Amino acid sequence: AAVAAGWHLASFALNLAFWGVEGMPPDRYWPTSPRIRLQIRPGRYGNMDGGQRVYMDYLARSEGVPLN
Amino acid sequence: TSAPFISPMTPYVPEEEPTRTPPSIKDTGTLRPASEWYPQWMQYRRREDNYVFWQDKFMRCSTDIPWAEKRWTLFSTVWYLVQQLRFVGTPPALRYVAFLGWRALMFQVYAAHKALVLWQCKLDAGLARIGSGGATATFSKTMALRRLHWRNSPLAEALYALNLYKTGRVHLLPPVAKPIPRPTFFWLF
Amino acid sequence: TVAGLLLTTTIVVSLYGLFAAVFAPAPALPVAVGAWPGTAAAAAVMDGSAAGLRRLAAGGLLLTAAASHGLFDFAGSVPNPTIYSLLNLGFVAAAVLQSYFLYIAPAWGVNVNWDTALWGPMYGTAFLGLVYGLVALTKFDWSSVVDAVLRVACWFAELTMWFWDTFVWKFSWSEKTRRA
């Protein structure tokens, strides 16, 4: 059992050593927003003028803004 | 002569495209490593003359690549995977540790090579004595410096040793080695 | 092409018929041990009549072989291609009447099956000449078979599309939708 857990621990330590992006250049086949990559945009229906309001609070809850 | 119209006194040798990028500007000819970031000679020049650092970087990285380093072959689409592992699949911290270790190793190796070069200088200065039979005991500093910068092929070394052993003549030097061109086969490599 | 294919196979089948029939001495009939130990040729060998009458048939199939090799190597660009209509009759009429006799050889009480080295070429050449007449009547252009296979393939594609959309997984599910 010790060996079989040490394998996973080694993998986790390796993933820890990365820590982020510093060292990784930008890549053009893999932007950071999946909508650019997947070509997704709205249409004509399903767009109410009262939607942007709720949009904002979603934003406010994602960025951490506690006001709501 | 083949030349029907025009023929200078030295025959024209058809020079071809270069096949490899030149040594950078920061490197030396020897084995000892470069300088991490800035060279040392940069300190003895005009600030408006040290623009050749970044220009050389631009030239080697982007604008002067010889079209022979851009051939798509079956060997290169596998070397791509090796290199992409090293650059994107390995964390920069382990790469940094390996970099430090490799630097230390190269310093030890360069020290060894310098010791060997001085030993060779005594040996050939001794061989020229047998050669001339009499007085000659010197050596050639030109050959020492050429040995340190890896500018001799093995055949040139052997022929120089023989010339020394037979006729002294310590100042007759083999011509110089030319750089090795990039080997290409076909779609293969 | 198609008629060219028929004429080529005719010349080579008749070539084989000859090159096999004469280059060997003669065949030997089935013994059928115990077949009336007296006369009536039961359990016996063969004879002059048989041998020579057959040696003839070989020459007839040679004649039509040469006619067909001539027509192939001449009108393979199919001089003037049309008035060969003369020879065409001579290659079709005979053929069909030949087949007629063969088509009643079982009723005539003949054994056509024991010896392949003679009846094979005759039957095959009769069939080939008849189908050649048929194809020359309607002019199979050697590209009309392509239209036939494309028609049957289009039908079976229309079949598997219905089957897939009805019983396996709807086409409105598996394909992507736009606009959102």
From TrEMBL, chain A:
This is Uncharacterized protein. The chain holds residues 70 to 137 of 137 of the full protein. It comes from the Eukaryota.
From TrEMBL, chain B:
The chain holds residues 67 to 255 of 255 of the full protein. It comes from the Eukaryota. It comes from Chlamydomonas reinhardtii. This is Uncharacterized protein.
From TrEMBL, chain C:
The chain crosses the membrane at residues 13-36, 82-105, 117-137. This is Uncharacterized protein. It comes from Chlamydomonas reinhardtii.
